[PDB]
């Protein structure tokens, strides 16, 4: 508990309650003034204050009764998939059955209809083939009591039972109606008139053979076709439509789709029932990828007798495939083919009559449309890495090759005008055959350049994955494991393919030696015979909450998003995994903040201590104003088009009921912890199973290792954000008020932290002209020039003392926020805000680690990524694993994947990954180099110390002359200088000017300063500087410097007379220091709130 309040938190009256009660799940002090009562639903009734808590009560009532019904009617308990579907069925929500290959969709459909018939409600269950209509009824009749009115209908019906049904349908108040999809398509109007409380559908593809079926289903749950028409017009218009709130439909359930839900009619489901008819994207694999170093036909035989049965071969072409079919046939192995008998030779291996099936890439990779049995295919062999090959000659070289070359050469730049015959012409006249290849190899980084056969080989990560995933599918709760063995000797191919698999699938392909075959086979076949065994299912649902959609944008990019439930103010995605279902959605920002109105600008004080009072946030989409106070129109532009975060909080309460375990994965700081608390505290009366995880790499690995350090809400971090939020709110309102009563303007003062910085800027202009010293540039003959104290005139430099030594240069530690700002706002024409903004996009997309740190630590994973790159570039022996830091809060800014910035451009223009700009790539490049510089070999050089006498005045100049041994300098370059003989040198020309010893400020110099001085934290660095630009206290010039405006000078000068102890660096640093000790729990929380308070009242008197 942090002793705070939330204005719309209460589970009951839906209003104000504390931070200490809602955690325990109790209603507010008004609903239930009892401290720790025995029951809630009992006591609230005894106080005549029972209101909305009634819903969450009868919810768990009808659920546990439903769960009791299944347990009594059927065998064991519900599965995680079913438990999610059951909670959706009691709320009355329509949804898609997101599930793997037969988890029990047909089974659940009956128990619902039976449990709804027991209540009195009637339903209808639709299946494709009529063979299913009977078996559904066959199990139905021998299950339910005599009470239920079970009727059936199909094509091959009896002569008199056929008519017996249709009269009962039009009349007799039935309970369960089982019929075929054929029935729904033909008997449209009959069904449309009637109404069902529940409608179950098996094969959704059979239903989607027409538009007369979608309209029917919607009318089969109590929706007039009048609404459908108006809804059908708006989805046609180009946007979305909202169903009449007073309309109360039934419950429709559809299964996963085989093909894509293409059309406009399926959009009716999303806007009339708040659910999207999704298809099954099941990227849930557990495969071990091993690679054999060479196409040794003897070694394949060695592996085929390790697997014995259930092996697959993938040859590059039908040629070398037929060859392998000949070779193995002489060794008497049960081996078939696919290029001949696509059907018969397949079904034989399906039985066990054949042990090995040799296939191709575009033959079997295209003939996989039938069944695909993942319980037979245990092993997959790749006789040659799947890829495409283009021969480069006069012609034959594809258009995209001649494009990118001449794009950088210059002749195709004419609006990128594409041509077939013309691009051949451009080649011959300009480039010789040798010149052409040297240009292609110099441009196309990432792919394979085979100058021998004059071919271009580009790895097919798509084909490799599809051929691999045929040995790993989720069958009956258990997820079986397959093994993929690659046979490629061309090291450029194997490395290029391994890169894009670690980019897309994130799966390490390993060498042959570091893999135990007889050990891998065991955990493959044992996993196989466990999938078959009487599974005591253990699949479950999971909810995960982030604060940014961009995080979620890529979260779904590695999970396997199958559907999207637009639930209120947010949109929750759900994917398929081995642990069951997994739900995840974003908050699109914060949720709570201090109320500008009452209290000390949002702070109450009771029982001696301080109490913050929070409210839901509303960010307008038109003007963009942000406020906490509950309003309907934006008090800036009067637009009702607002974004109420309380409609998100209440939205998450609905979803919190459905899922089992809920995890909050936000920004691992104090800002992301404040949000993580406002949500867990909100979903604590609802769910009582909610934990915290902190993600640093938005990938498979960074997610797994985030749950390996799962914890609960650290209140110190929450306290830390509060104290700081209170700080700039209290002081920031006081000082800005002083400006109102002077300079006139309202909102100006951003606080204390941003104002002290302006103090440096005003007094940087002051001590600027103080050091305007005369200097001279001295261009030297045969050697490099240098600058010294000016006004010299003798044209001769005399070497006095010289000494050479062999020093070894070590690189600089990885980027922090202070480092990745300055060294990138320098080397790129960028401001600290734009730099930091690009960084967030690089982290929340899974390209770099956490972009808001102060540590330099690099874990073994970071060091291993570095080495695996140097081993890819060819120089593995220049690697040096540097720990860099013992005390590591977070981890230093580093690339999460061993892929250089040029390999990234290639993947994008190839058509694999996307959503990147050049402003992004140069920021990734700048970091990729720096990290790999900070993880390479040291440079052994040889530098000299020249002491030269110029105009009677000595001077010591140290410079590197030789690089004796290479190292880290391959990434971040090292500047060498020409040698100095111990002779006399003359000056060619002189440039006389007068720069300053004490220079000026830039956007980087500020961050540079407030890091040394100790003012601000990594998150606040980009903000503070840009804020000064915003208010108008600082302007830029020719050199893009930092100077105080006419406004900025008067503002700071005013404060230094009347309010100096509040804006002093020596006190500003003392606050950030103390507040950082609150973050670790060294200085008391309520203590530092009194200290902020004490200085405020003294300020409120001047
Ligand atoms: Zn209440
Ligand atoms: Zn507005």
Quick one: residue 642, left, alpha or beta (phi over 0 = left, psi -120 to 50 = alpha)? Answer: beta
Report CA(28)–ligand 1 centroid distance (Å). 4
Report CA(592)–ligand 2 centroid distance (Å). 19
660 is in an annotated binding site: no
Q: Give domain limits for the chain.
A: 1-36+591-643, 37-278, 279-386+461-539, 387-460, 540-590+644-714, 715-769+999-1102, 770-812+935-998, 813-934
Query: Among all ligands shown, which has an atom nearest to the Cα of 16?
Result: 1
Query: Among all ligands shown, which has an atom nearest to the Cα of 49?
Result: 1
Distance separating alpha carbons of residues 816 and 274, to the nearest angstrom = 44
Distance separating alpha carbons of residues 1047 and 29, to the nearest angstrom = 50
Assigned superfamily of 715-769+999-1102: Topoisomerase I, domain 2 (1.10.460.10)
Sign of dihedral through CA atoms 716, 721, 726, 731?
positive
Instruction: Tell me the pairing of strands 356-359 and 796-801.
Output: unpaired
623 is in an annotated binding site: yes
Query: Among all ligands shown, which has an atom nearest to the Cα of 32?
Result: 1
Report CA(350)–ligand 1 centroid distance (Å). 63
Assigned superfamily of 37-278: P-loop containing nucleotide triphosphate hydrolases (3.40.50.300)
Is 540-590+644-714 in the same CATH topology as 37-278? yes
100 is in an annotated binding site: yes
Report CA(897)–ligand 1 centroid distance (Å). 50
The pocket of ion ligand 1, defined by CB under 5 A, consists of: 10, 12-13, 27-28, 31
Terminal C-alpha separation, the chain: 36
**Token pair 């061993």 in the structure block, residue:** 898
Taking a C-beta distance cutoff of 8 angstroms, is the pair 718, 673 a contact? yes
Residue 816 exposed, middle or buried by CB count within 10 Å (0-12, 13-18, 19+)? buried
Which of 696, 705, 699 has the alpha carbon at shortest distance from 899? 699
Residue 414 exposed, middle or buried by CB count within 10 Å (0-12, 13-18, 19+)? exposed
Q: Is 850 assigned a catalytic role?
A: yes
Tokens encoding 1? 């508990």
Query: Among all ligands shown, which has an atom nearest to the Cα of 10?
Result: 1
DSSP, collapsed to helix, strand or coil, labels residue 840 as helix
Contacts of 10 (CB under 8 A, 6+ apart): 16, 17, 22, 27, 28, 31
Report CA(622)–ligand 2 centroid distance (Å). 5
Method: X-ray
Angle between helices 753-766 and 1020-1031 (to 10 degrees): 70
Report CA(16)–ligand 1 centroid distance (Å). 7
Fold for 540-590+644-714, please state it.
Answer: Rossmann fold (3.40.50)
Q: What share of residues in the chain are helix, strand, coil (percent, to 5)? A: 40, 20, 45
Angle, CA 1012 vertex, CA 1007 and CA 1018 arms, to 5°? 50
What is the CB neighbour count within 10 angstroms for residue 149?
A: 15
What is the CB neighbour count within 10 angstroms for residue 1003?
A: 27
74 is in an annotated binding site: yes
Instruction: Tell me the pairing of strands 150-152 and 176-180.
Output: parallel
Query: Among all ligands shown, which has an atom nearest to the Cα of 619?
Result: 2
For 924-986, the DSSP string reads: HHHHHHHHHHTTB--EEEEEEEEEEEETTEEEEEEEEEEEEE-SGGGTS---------SSEEE
Distances, alpha carbon 303 to alpha carbons 100, 358, 699, 786, in Å: 31, 14, 33, 68
Distances, alpha carbon 544 to alpha carbons 275, 851, 1085, in Å: 19, 21, 30
Tokens encoding 126? 């639709």
Angle, CA 893 vertex, CA 890 and CA 899 arms, to 5°? 130
Q: 68-92: buried (b, 16+ CB within 10 Å) or exposed (e) per residue?
A: ebbeeebeeebbbbbbbbbbbbbee
Report CA(8)–ligand 1 centroid distance (Å). 9
For 502-570, the DSSP string reads: HHHT---EEESTT--HHHHHHHHHHHHHHHHS--------EEEEES-HHHHHHHHHHHTEEEEE--TTS
Strand runs (DSSP E) across 463-502, as ranges? 474-475, 478-479, 482-487
Sign of dihedral through CA atoms 434, 440, 442, 445?
negative
Helix (H) or strand (E) segment spanning residue 754: helix 753-766
19 is in an annotated binding site: no
Sign of dihedral through CA atoms 732, 735, 740, 744?
negative
Taking a C-beta distance cutoff of 8 angstroms, is the pair 304, 369 a contact? no
Tokens encoding 31? 């609903």
What is the CB neighbour count within 10 angstroms for residue 253?
A: 24
Distance separating alpha carbons of residues 359 and 380, to the nearest angstrom = 10
959 is in an annotated binding site: no
Report CA(619)–ligand 2 centroid distance (Å). 8
1020 is in an annotated binding site: no
Report CA(643)–ligand 2 centroid distance (Å). 10
Strand runs (DSSP E) across 212-281, as ranges? 251-255
Catalytic residue among 63, 815, 850, 869: 850
Distance separating alpha carbons of residues 177 and 113, to the nearest angstrom = 10
28 is in an annotated binding site: yes
Angle between helices 1003-1012 and 832-843 (to 10 degrees): 80
Angle, CA 114 vertex, CA 111 and CA 117 arms, to 5°? 150
Taking a C-beta distance cutoff of 8 angstroms, is the pair 672, 547 a contact? yes
What is the CB neighbour count within 10 angstroms for residue 146?
A: 6
450 is in an annotated binding site: no
Angle, CA 81 vertex, CA 79 and CA 85 arms, to 5°? 110
Distance separating alpha carbons of residues 829 and 816, to the nearest angstrom = 19
Q: CATH says 770-812+935-998 is which class?
A: mainly beta
Distance separating alpha carbons of residues 400 and 416, to the nearest angstrom = 11
**Token pair 């063995």 in the structure block, residue:** 485
**Of the options 1.20.1440.230, 3.40.50.720, 1.10.290.10, 1.10.3720.10, the CATH number for the domain spanning 813-934:** 1.10.290.10
DSSP, collapsed to helix, strand or coil, labels residue 165 as helix
Query: Among all ligands shown, which has an atom nearest to the Cα of 27?
Result: 1
Helix (H) or strand (E) segment spanning residue 400: helix 399-409
69 is in an annotated binding site: no
Report CA(632)–ligand 2 centroid distance (Å). 11
CATH 3.10.20.90 fits 387-460, yes or no: no
Q: 843-882: buried (b, 16+ CB within 10 Å) or exposed (e) per residue?
A: bbbbbbbbbbbbbbbbbebbbebbbbbbebeeeeebbbeb
Instruction: Tell me the pairing of strands 984-993 and 796-801.
Output: antiparallel
Fold for 279-386+461-539, please state it.
Answer: Rossmann fold (3.40.50)
């Amino acid at each position: 508990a942090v002793n705070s309040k939330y204005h719309h938190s209460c589970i009951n009256c839906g209003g104000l309650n504390t931070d200490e009660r809602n955690e325990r799940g109790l209603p507010c002090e008004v609903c239930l003034p009892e401290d720790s009562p025995s029951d809630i639903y009992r006591a609230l009734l005894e106080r005549k204050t029972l209101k909305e808590y009634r819903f969450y009560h009868e919810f768990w009532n009808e659920y546990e009764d439903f769960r009791s019904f299944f347990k009594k009617k059927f065998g064991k308990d519900l599965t995680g998939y079913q438990r999610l579907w059951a909670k959706r069925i009691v709320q009355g929500k329509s949804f898609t059955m997101v599930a793997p290959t037969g988890v029990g969709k047909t089974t659940f459909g009956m128990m619902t209809a039976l449990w709804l018939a027991r209540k009195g409600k009637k339903s209808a269950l639709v299946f494709p083939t009529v063979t299913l209509v009977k078996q559904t009824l066959e199990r139905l009749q021998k299950l339910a009591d005599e009470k239920v009115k079970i009727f059936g209908f199909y094509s091959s019906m009896k002569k008199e039972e056929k008519e017996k049904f249709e009269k009962s349908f039009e009349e007799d108040d039935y309970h369960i109606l089982v019929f075929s999809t054929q029935f729904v398509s033909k008997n449209r109007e009959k069904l449309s008139q009637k109404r069902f409380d529940f409608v179950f559908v098996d094969d959704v593809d059979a239903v989607l053979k027409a538009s007369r079926n979608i309209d029917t289903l919607l009318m089969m749950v109590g929706i007039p076709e009048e609404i459908i028409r108006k809804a059908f017009s708006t989805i046609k218009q180009g946007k979305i439509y909202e169903r009449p709130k007073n309309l109360k439909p039934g419950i429709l359930v559809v299964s996963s789709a085989t093909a894509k839900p293409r059309g406009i009619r399926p959009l009716l489901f999303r806007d009339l029932l708040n659910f999207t008819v999704g298809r099954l994207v099941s990227v849930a694999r557990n495969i071990t990828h091993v690679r054999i170093s060479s196409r040794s036909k003897e070694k394949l035989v060695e592996l085929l007798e390790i697997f014995r049965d259930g092996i697959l071969i993938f040859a590059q072409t039908e040629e070398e495939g037929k060859e392998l079919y000949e070779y193995l046939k002489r060794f008497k192995f049960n081996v078939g083919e696919t290029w001949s008998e696509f059907e018969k030779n397949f079904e034989d291996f399906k039985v066990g009559k054949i042990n090995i099936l040799i296939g191709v890439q575009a033959y079997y990779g295209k003939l996989t449309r039938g069944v695909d049995l993942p319980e037979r295919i245990k092993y997959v062999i790749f006789w040659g890495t799947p890829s495409m090959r283009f021969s480069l000659e006069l012609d034959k070289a594809p258009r995209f090759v001649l494009a990118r070359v001449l794009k950088e050469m210059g002749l195709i730049k004419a609006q990128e005008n594409p041509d077939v015959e013309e691009l051949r012409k451009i080649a011959k006249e300009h480039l010789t055959q040798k010149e052409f290849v040297e240009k292609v190899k110099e441009m196309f980084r990432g792919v394979v350049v085979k100058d021998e056969d004059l071919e271009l080989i580009i790895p097919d990560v798509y084909t490799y994955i599809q051929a691999s995933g045929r040995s790993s599918r989720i069958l009956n709760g258990v997820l079986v494991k397959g093994v993929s063995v690659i046979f490629e000797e061309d090291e450029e191919i194997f490395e290029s393919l391994k890169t894009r698999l670690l980019l897309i699938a994130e799966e390490e392909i390993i060498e042959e030696a570091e893999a135990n075959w007889k050990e891998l086979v065991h955990e493959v076949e044992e996993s196989r015979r466990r999938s078959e065994r009487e599974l005591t299912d253990t699949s479950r649902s999971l909810l995960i909450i982030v604060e940014s959609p961009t995080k979620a944008e890529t979260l779904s990019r590695f999970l396997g998003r199958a559907s999207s439930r637009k639930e209120r103010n947010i949109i929750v995605h759900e994917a398929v995994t081995g642990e069951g279902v997994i739900l995840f959605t974003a908050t699109r920002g914060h949720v709570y903040d201090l109320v500008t109105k009452g209290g000390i600008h949002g702070v109450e004080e009771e029982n001696g201590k301080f109490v913050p009072v929070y409210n839901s946030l509303k960010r307008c989409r038109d003007c963009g104003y942000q406020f906490t106070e509950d309003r309907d129109e934006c008090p800036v532009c009067s637009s009702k088009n607002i974004d109420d975060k309380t409609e998100t909080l209440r939205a998450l309460r609905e979803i919190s009921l459905e899922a089992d375990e809920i995890l909050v994965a936000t920004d691992p700081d104090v800002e992301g912890e404040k949000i993580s608390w406002d949500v867990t505290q909100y979903l604590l009366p609802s769910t009582r199973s909610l934990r915290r995880i902190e993600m640093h790499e938005i990938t498979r690995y960074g997610f797994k290792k985030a749950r390996e350090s799962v914890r609960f809400v650290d209140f110190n971090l929450v306290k830390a954000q509060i104290v700081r939020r209170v700080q700039d709110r209290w002081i920031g309102f006081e000082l800005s008020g002083k400006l109102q009563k002077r300079f006139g303007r309202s909102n100006l003062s951003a606080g204390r932290v941003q104002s002290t910085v302006l103090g440096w800027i005003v007094e940087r202009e002051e001590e600027y002209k103080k050091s305007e010293k005369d200097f001279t540039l001295l261009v030297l003959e045969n050697g490099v020039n240098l600058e010294v104290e000016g006004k010299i005139a003798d044209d001769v430099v005399t070497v006095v003392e010289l000494q050479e030594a062999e020093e070894e240069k070590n690189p600089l530690p990885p980027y922090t926020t202070s480092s990745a700002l300055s060294e990138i706002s320098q080397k790129l024409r960028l401001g600290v805000q734009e730099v930091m903004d690009i960084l967030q996009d690089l982290f929340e997309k899974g390209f770099i680690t956490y972009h808001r740190t102060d540590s330099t630590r690099i874990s073994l994973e970071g060091q291993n990524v570095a080495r695996t790159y140097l081993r890819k570039i060819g120089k593995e022996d220049i690697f040096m694993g540097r720990s860099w830091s013992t005390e590591g809060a977070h981890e230093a800014i580093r690339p999460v994947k061993p892929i250089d910035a040029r390999e990234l451009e290639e993947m994008i223009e190839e058509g694999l990954i996307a959503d990147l700009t050049k402003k992004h790539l140069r920021v990734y490049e700048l970091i990729f180099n720096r990290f790999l510089a900070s993880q390479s070999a040291a440079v052994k050089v040889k530098k000299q110390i020249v002491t030269v006498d110029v105009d009677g005045k000595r001077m010591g100049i140290e410079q590197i002359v030789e690089i004796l041994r290479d190292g880290w300098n391959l990434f971040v370059p090292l500047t060498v200088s020409p040698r100095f003989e111990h002779r006399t040198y003359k000056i060619k020309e002189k440039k006389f000017y007068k720069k300053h010893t004490v220079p000026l400020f830039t956007q980087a110099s500020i961050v540079e300063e407030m890091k040394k001085r100790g003012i601000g934290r990594p998150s606040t660095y980009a903000k503070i500087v840009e804020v000064l630009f915003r208010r108008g206290y600082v302007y830029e010039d020719k050199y893009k410097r930092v100077r105080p405006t006419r406004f900025g000078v008067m503002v700071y000068s005013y404060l230094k007379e009347r309010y100096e102890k509040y804006v002093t660096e020596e006190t500003t640093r003392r606050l950030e220091e103390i507040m950082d000790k609150v973050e670790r729990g060294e200085e008391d929380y309520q203590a530092t709130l009194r200290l902020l308070y004490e200085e405020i009242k003294s300020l409120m008197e001047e």
